[PDB]
Design an enzyme around this catalytic site. Sequence first.
Site, PDB file in Angstrom:
ATOM      1  N   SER A 112     -26.241  -4.205  24.798  1.00  0.00           N
ATOM      2  CA  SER A 112     -24.895  -3.873  25.263  1.00  0.00           C
ATOM      3  C   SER A 112     -24.815  -2.449  25.818  1.00  0.00           C
ATOM      4  O   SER A 112     -24.360  -2.231  26.949  1.00  0.00           O
ATOM      5  CB  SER A 112     -23.878  -4.061  24.127  1.00  0.00           C
ATOM      6  N   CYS A 149     -25.574  -8.931  20.772  1.00  0.00           N
ATOM      7  CA  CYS A 149     -24.317  -9.634  21.011  1.00  0.00           C
ATOM      8  C   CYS A 149     -24.526 -10.860  21.897  1.00  0.00           C
ATOM      9  O   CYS A 149     -24.062 -11.961  21.579  1.00  0.00           O
ATOM     10  CB  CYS A 149     -23.310  -8.671  21.649  1.00  0.00           C
ATOM     11  N   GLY A 153     -25.345 -12.808  18.406  1.00  0.00           N
ATOM     12  CA  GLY A 153     -24.165 -12.139  17.858  1.00  0.00           C
ATOM     13  C   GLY A 153     -22.843 -12.649  18.419  1.00  0.00           C
ATOM     14  O   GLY A 153     -22.565 -13.852  18.320  1.00  0.00           O
ATOM     15  N   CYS A 154     -22.037 -11.760  19.032  1.00  0.00           N
ATOM     16  CA  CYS A 154     -20.642 -12.089  19.351  1.00  0.00           C
ATOM     17  C   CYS A 154     -20.525 -13.370  20.170  1.00  0.00           C
ATOM     18  O   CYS A 154     -19.604 -14.174  19.955  1.00  0.00           O
ATOM     19  CB  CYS A 154     -19.954 -10.963  20.136  1.00  0.00           C
ATOM     20  N   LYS A 157     -21.746 -16.692  18.213  1.00  0.00           N
ATOM     21  CA  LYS A 157     -20.925 -16.890  17.018  1.00  0.00           C
ATOM     22  C   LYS A 157     -19.494 -17.292  17.378  1.00  0.00           C
ATOM     23  O   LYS A 157     -18.896 -18.129  16.687  1.00  0.00           O
ATOM     24  CB  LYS A 157     -20.977 -15.644  16.117  1.00  0.00           C
ATOM     25  N   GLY A 387     -26.624  -7.082   5.506  1.00  0.00           N
ATOM     26  CA  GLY A 387     -26.606  -5.841   6.253  1.00  0.00           C
ATOM     27  C   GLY A 387     -27.697  -5.790   7.311  1.00  0.00           C
ATOM     28  O   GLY A 387     -28.563  -6.660   7.403  1.00  0.00           O
ATOM     29  N   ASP A 428     -25.289   1.141  18.151  1.00  0.00           N
ATOM     30  CA  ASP A 428     -25.329   1.020  16.692  1.00  0.00           C
ATOM     31  C   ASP A 428     -26.178   2.106  16.020  1.00  0.00           C
ATOM     32  O   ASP A 428     -25.944   2.432  14.846  1.00  0.00           O
ATOM     33  CB  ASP A 428     -25.850  -0.362  16.281  1.00  0.00           C
ATOM     34  N   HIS A 566       9.282 -14.953  22.966  1.00  0.00           N
ATOM     35  CA  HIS A 566       9.527 -16.125  22.115  1.00  0.00           C
ATOM     36  C   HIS A 566       9.201 -17.412  22.870  1.00  0.00           C
ATOM     37  O   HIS A 566       9.570 -17.540  24.046  1.00  0.00           O
ATOM     38  CB  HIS A 566      11.025 -16.140  21.650  1.00  0.00           C
TER      39      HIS A 566
END
Lengths: 588, 588
Positions: A112, A149, A153-154, A157, A387, A428, A566
Amino acid sequence: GTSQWLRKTVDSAAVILFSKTTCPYCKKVKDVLAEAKIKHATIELDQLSNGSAIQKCLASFSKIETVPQMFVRGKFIGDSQTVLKYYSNDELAGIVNESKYDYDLIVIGGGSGGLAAGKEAAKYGAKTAVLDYVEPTPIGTTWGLGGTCVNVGCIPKKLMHQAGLLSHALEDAEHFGWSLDRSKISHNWSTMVEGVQSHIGSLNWGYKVALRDNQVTYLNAKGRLISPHEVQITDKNQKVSTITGNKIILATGERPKYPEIPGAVEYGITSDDLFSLPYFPGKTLVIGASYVALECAGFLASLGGDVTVMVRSILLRGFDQQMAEKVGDYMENHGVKFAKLCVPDEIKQLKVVDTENNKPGLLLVKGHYTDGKKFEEEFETVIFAVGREPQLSKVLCETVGVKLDKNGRVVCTDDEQTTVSNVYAIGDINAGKPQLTPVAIQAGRYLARRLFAGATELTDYSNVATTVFTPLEYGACGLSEEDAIEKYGDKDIEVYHSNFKPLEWTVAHREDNVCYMKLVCRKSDNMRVLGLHVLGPNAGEITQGYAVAIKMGATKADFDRTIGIHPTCSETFTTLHVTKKSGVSPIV
Amino acid sequence: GTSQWLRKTVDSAAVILFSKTTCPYCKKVKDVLAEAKIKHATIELDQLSNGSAIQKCLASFSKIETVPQMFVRGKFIGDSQTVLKYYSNDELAGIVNESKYDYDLIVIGGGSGGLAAGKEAAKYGAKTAVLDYVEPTPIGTTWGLGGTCVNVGCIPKKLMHQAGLLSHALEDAEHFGWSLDRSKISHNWSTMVEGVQSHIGSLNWGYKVALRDNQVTYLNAKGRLISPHEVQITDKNQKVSTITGNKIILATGERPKYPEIPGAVEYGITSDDLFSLPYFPGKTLVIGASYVALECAGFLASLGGDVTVMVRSILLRGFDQQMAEKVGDYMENHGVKFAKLCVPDEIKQLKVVDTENNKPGLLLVKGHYTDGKKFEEEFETVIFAVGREPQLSKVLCETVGVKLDKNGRVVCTDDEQTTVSNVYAIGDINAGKPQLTPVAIQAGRYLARRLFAGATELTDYSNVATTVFTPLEYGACGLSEEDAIEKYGDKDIEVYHSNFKPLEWTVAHREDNVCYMKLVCRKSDNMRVLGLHVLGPNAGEITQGYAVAIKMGATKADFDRTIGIHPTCSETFTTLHVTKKSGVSPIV
Ligand SMILES: Cc1cc2nc3c(=O)[nH]c(=O)nc-3n(C[C@H](O)[C@H](O)[C@H](O)COP(=O)(O)OP(=O)(O)OC[C@H]3O[C@@H](n4cnc5c(N)ncnc54)[C@H](O)[C@@H]3O)c2cc1C
Ligand SMILES: Cc1cc2nc3c(=O)[nH]c(=O)nc-3n(C[C@H](O)[C@H](O)[C@H](O)COP(=O)(O)OP(=O)(O)OC[C@H]3O[C@@H](n4cnc5c(N)ncnc54)[C@H](O)[C@@H]3O)c2cc1C
Ligand SMILES: COC(=O)[C@@H]1C[C@H](O)CN1C(=O)c1ccco1
Ligand SMILES: COC(=O)[C@@H]1C[C@H](O)CN1C(=O)c1ccco1
Ligand SMILES: COC(=O)[C@@H]1C[C@H](O)CN1C(=O)c1ccco1
Ligand SMILES: COC(=O)[C@@H]1C[C@H](O)CN1C(=O)c1ccco1
């Protein structure tokens, strides 16, 4: 400050043109550069309030004060007449490719952050290499360009989360008049995986095309920084060589951890393996309680699996714990079993995975509860989500001088610079930063613009919104309630809250008082919204827009004066009134 | 200003107590009032920076400067000793019920605005009556308490929209691995209607319970204001009488219009009839192009109907027209037919509705295009959605003196006051205001607090967000692009835009470049966001949170510095960069 900015900009830009939008000579240089396919940054002095001062400071490098002025790697190249002279004599291409190093930028890591940074730098004329290598998992799983990702990952998933959400859509459709019978419909895991993996394959290919179209060199090779400007690479044939670069960006990410117990590496799997698994996991134990653990447990249950989660202490450590408990209660009422206050001691093999019949094996899990009582149960698949960690000792020779913290992550300044002046770190592995894909992309893009186009904007890491895609989703932005109280004291904190029921759930006969939201506010600062929390459908779509308002310093009064749309779930935020101090019930 | 506020507050409050949070005598009066079930407003002077001045001004009414001070309908009643004297002698109940009028408040109209206003007023001790009557449609349709949104508007229309959205969920489920075959599933209209109407019935009943529990008198009777304080009522037996009230709130809403052509009233229907229709409409013509017309045409198509929309000029007049055309293109590619530049001339009956076999009739529609060419086609159902209007000549004797505009709506000040000082108007009949349910509720609640609890906050009608629940939904907040350009000039307007594709659509093989968003910004005001527009799934959830940021004056820079939540549709707003002036394509 102007003079200090100008020096830093000139020194690090690969190719840069100082210009004015109204100058025909600047227009003439622009055309020549575009015709020769020479990419560059451009700074239009007439569009900066600081422009007259900048024009004066340029003479410190070039001895002239006019525009245009073209620079290559810190060296003044010429004005209009001189650039066209080099063009006409076919000398310009060699001048702009002249460098002390092979590359203006080497990015180690093609995920990423690293892909974002590399593409943005190349747009301003930086000669860029992106290195990416995927070390296989213990059982052999590997994947293509894009990072965690995109591949594990993202993206997969959330697609598996959607597959699980469609089970309730099938149930609801009968109540809305559709003639299907949900109890006679089943799910095919391998058909799902084939569709998920075909999308991922299109992303792998899209990234290789994008790098090629930006003139970025892609090397599928493992990188190691051995001195400030030297990167040793090892390719798929174990051939070793060295390349040099002016600036270095470290963007290598993390990988899953395993507990130090017998059988874990041999017989368990992680999220790295789950998203391309050729067989349905079957009866499954998930060890861990992070958002990864609960997200995977959740969709496995919705796809028909018999699923147990083993929790060492608490769910979602670091998130608001009232919200974490509501998240888990919903999962537990919709099929997920929990073994609380429990850790594993060993995994024993009872059956080997059946690779030909396409079937999982069988395992015996032994563990214990915190009071000493014993856990013992058989499962077909065991997934560890305990982790993730970097392995920078493989990336980074310790003699280079890049400082790491106690957890092995890189200590950086607020502009991502490491303790070695030309080396930066994003994503990360940057110590202390939120570990999310949009953060890595913003950090990489903004950094490339500071290095190669003279930008000044820093990445803002505060109040970054999140969403956990559990079966009932949980969105948040800002402080948890308990963190706010710790920082300011209970007397200075007011909490507005309410249950709610989506209109879609009424005819479908779903639950009355499970969805929930709250605003955590500071009394002594005009009722500033310190944190926003929502548990309900589409929670990421709900939360995102409010992140802008919180960045701007929204108060309870700002929420009150804004009118709702609404019928929506999100509108409940615009009319909150019940306080926790009042003791009044939040139910509908 | 303090003295002018205090006089207005004392004069109009029904029962009000001036107090301090730290006074045991105030606490003693509070307990007596709570024990006697006497509801009242309370103003704690120690929590207002203006409190010392207010305490001094009270002596202008009571000749005392201490707290507590209790007032009933503009009259000072007593301090601590005196209130307890009236209690002990059983005189207090008669004192607080003493009034010149039957009611402190009469609300004419029991809908979104009127119910909100009536319940809020009663909470501060105002003796309140709510009147509601539902004049039946031409074919006889009627319904219960709650108004247009609850019974024949937002609530049933969004539930029918969800029924239609579930058809694509059924199609998508096969691609995500579920074993159903969409082509063998059908929809049952009457089963849907039964479920929608059972929810609506629960809302009708919920409102009657809420009024009873707030001590509000509910009269199912048609009201007519004949003088400033006199309301003539007619009940279900045609019995006529008069009631009096101090303050009057008009909240009677609007009803559908019919075109003045032969056959329209006799043989067509409107949205009033559609949501409880006992038979599926069949082949259907929708005449009109408002959001009502396109929303109903859209879900009828998704539920399997053969649907045509007849458009006089344009779609969604008053909304951004680039977005309106994208909305209609999507509907036209997914089954809805359009007859453009066309109006009807007559409706002829070919078959009477079959009330016993539960089947529609059959009609012949004749019309013409703007060039003169002829339209002629048969339909089973014809639905008129050509606008809505009030009929205040039935509500309001012209001798009372309430000023109306050219369209028959009520001309009000910015605190909802009419040209008669005790009479107010809220909701759709308030001239010039956005005609939405959350606007009516906020206006009614805030007004009740100004009348009966001394509040000062006005309703803010600017930049109110909207969502059109067409098959692909359209959310908006602020100015359309063409309105912004008209106001400020093209040179001062910058538009950032992008196509996008929901992650959910990838494995389902849906369209690449149909969803779209843009931000319309003002260059000379720090790139202020003047309008936000989005076409995509869950567009109301996406848009709502951004309404707060726009209310706070968000700029492009605020959107840029806020980080996205991944993977979502909404995050595309946080990284927009392609401008319309650049000419660069917005595709993915
Ligand atoms: C299961 C799961 C779900 C997630 N869901 C979300 C979500 O919904 N939303 C969200 O915002 N975030 C999510 N995340 C987090 C997100 O994936 C990460 O924050 C992001 O991928 C980090 O990006 P990066 O650039 O730092 O590293 P990565 O994406 O990990 O990329 C680093 C790359 O460099 C490679 N590499 C490593 N060492 C070397 C070397 N020596 N030489 C060359 N290449 C090397 C790695 O193999 C990898 O390809 C999720 C993570 C997981 C595990
Ligand atoms: C098909 C449709 C869909 C809609 N969808 C949405 C949506 O998604 N979102 C949104 O925000 N808005 C929506 N609206 C608009 C919303 O319904 C209105 O803005 C809202 O109902 C107006 O509230 P009100 O209090 O002004 O009047 P109403 O809700 O119309 O209530 C007025 C009431 O007073 C009664 N009455 C009339 N005359 C008298 C009398 N003389 N005596 C006694 N009672 C009387 C009426 O019969 C009615 O019950 C929609 C409207 C329609 C028609
Ligand atoms: C954060 O969660 C908690 O704190 C709760 C209480 C307990 O201490 C930890 N815990 C759970 O294990 C759980 C499972 C299902 C719902 O909650
Ligand atoms: C608020 O968003 C965050 O990401 C926060 C910021 C902070 O650094 C700690 N943190 C996380 O641990 C986290 C959440 C999801 C993955 O990591
Ligand atoms: C607002 O819509 C328009 O302006 C377009 C062009 C035309 O003038 C009116 N019109 C349509 O009738 C239409 C039908 C399906 C898509 O668009
Ligand atoms: C922006 O929200 C609005 O409601 C705007 C405000 C303005 O008064 C005109 N207007 C409408 O005509 C409208 C939209 C849906 C029903 O009416």
